[PDB]
Amino acid sequence: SMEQVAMELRLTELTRLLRSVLDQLQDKDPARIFAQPVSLKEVPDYLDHIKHPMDFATMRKRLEAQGYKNLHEFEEDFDLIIDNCMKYNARDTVFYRAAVRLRDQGGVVLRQARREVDSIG
DSSP: OHHHHHHHHHHHHHHHHHHHHHHHHHHTOTTOTTSSOOOTTTSTTHHHHOSSOOOHHHHHHHHHTTOOOSHHHHHHHHHHHHHHHHHHSOTTSHHHHHHHHHHHHHHHHHHHHHHHHHHHO
């Protein structure tokens, strides 16, 4: 149907906008602390601590399959990156501090992304 096509075009345009959002958030992580999944070879206990691991590469896979239907879903995954790190790592660590700075800087970007998603529809 044409209605199904139109819905698919909207998902594609959302995907474009989320791709640009993802780029902008990841630039706020120049250390690349959040680029890849925590390795279970190097942190064998991780899944005892963290139930839903997340990272920028995993988000990019989901994005490229058009797997985010709305901005809320994408924000949920970004918050997991931050929140997981702030739980596993102590306040005094470079990892925790990196997550705080990512959260603070990413807020700016997400605030305008929400406006854009509502504005364009």
